[PDB]
Design a protein around this ligand. Structure first.
Ligand code: ADP
Ligand code: ADP
Ligand code: MG
Ligand code: MG
Lengths: 143, 143
């Protein structure tokens, strides 16, 4: 039941100074950060990561925003982590995000929506391998 | 005035699930995390890092604790960062730690005091260069 999923705090999250608050949201929910790395993505990295949206019309802006500032890359671990993550994140459009979700509480607009999360276990594996070596991920007990 | 200093959330901080809470402490006090990386230190790394304490009787234990589990390495940037960081951390001995400090709130004992902070600017340069390439540190504008 324990899975690992990718979480990324987008540039607006760091600029709003809410890195800690966001991380706490996961921790309080049982989503254990087992890998964390603040990094400034290059255009090549963002494009390759979001390649699935190349045919889409906002892709170019998505890429620019994703490289406008540094982000915080994280791997969350827990039971049904992929889904749990999507739940706490909330809807893509902050306006439609549920109460208490990261996006409803911190997101500005649909373009600047503070966080990213793997949409599936399949994509989680890919996204995690894109940004982390297995040797960079470390689980630990909660006690 | 504006300085950069090294902060490390020791193994017990992650086990207590308070990474977010600790980071928020800094963010709200004006200490901006410009570099972050969760890592499991090796014996060689912990020893080399705490070289100044090589002749102290607690050295061997400090090293063992520091490699018992992963830690979160961070570089904080802000006004009088070196001193500011330490004030927020609190006294080495949790018993003597002031109200509202990280150690009084989260530390359990002196040999498991949750956080590390560079003790001086000269040492901050050394400690930061020990764990981070200049290319891994990224400042960004706030709100
Ligand atoms: N219909 C849309 N119109 C405009 N921008 C969108 C739309 N759908 C998605 N996006 C933007 O592209 C980003 C990436 O999409 P997605 O692949 O769903 O990842 P994510 O986890 O980052 O939300 C979204 O977070 C959002 O900013
Ligand atoms: N007298 C002591 N007895 C036991 N452990 C100690 C003692 N002094 C320091 N240490 C340990 O080694 C670390 C050394 O750091 P130090 O430079 O003494 O101050 P700090 O509290 O700012 O980290 C401490 O945080 C603590 O874990
Ligand atoms: Mg999608
Ligand atoms: Mg010290």
């Amino acid at each position: 039941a324990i899975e690992r999923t990718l979480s990324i705090i987008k540039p607006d999250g760091l600029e709003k100074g809410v890195i800690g608050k966001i991380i706490s949201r996961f921790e309080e929910k049982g989503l254990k950060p087992v890998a964390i790395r603040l990094q400034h993505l290059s255009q090549a990295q963002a494009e390759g990561f979001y390649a699935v949206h190349k045919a889409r019309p906002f892709f170019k802006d998505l890429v620019q925003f994703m490289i406008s500032g540094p982000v915080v890359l994280m791997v969350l671990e827990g039971e049904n982590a992929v889904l749990a993550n999507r739940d706490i994140m909330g809807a893509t459009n902050p306006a439609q995000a549920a109460e208490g979700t990261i996006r409803k509480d911190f997101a500005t607009s649909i373009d600047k929506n503070t966080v990213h999360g793997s949409d599936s276990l399949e994509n989680a594996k890919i996204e995690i391998a894109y940004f982390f070596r297995e040797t960079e991920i470390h689980s630990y007990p909660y006690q």
